[PDB]
Amino acid sequence: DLSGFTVKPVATVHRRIPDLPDCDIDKWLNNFNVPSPLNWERKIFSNC
């Protein structure tokens, strides 16, 4: 009984939601009004 094979994939399926906006993460990180550790700020990035 030889070692098990698996059928090779004949194609690739790639799916992503199209036309989503850019997240602009650099614009928020480069904002010059920087908070201290006491009042550390959060931003949430989704659908981008």
Add this chain to the structure above:
Amino acid sequence: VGGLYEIKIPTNFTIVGQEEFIQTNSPKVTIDCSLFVCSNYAACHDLL
């Protein structure tokens, strides 16, 4: 009672059937240890 004992002797009879299954075999299980432990993954086959 004197020399004699009381015994129940059959006066009529029938034949009865009884089934008995005896196991003599079992499912021949076989394992590919490599396919079970690692599936398709080359990084696992290397470590295995």
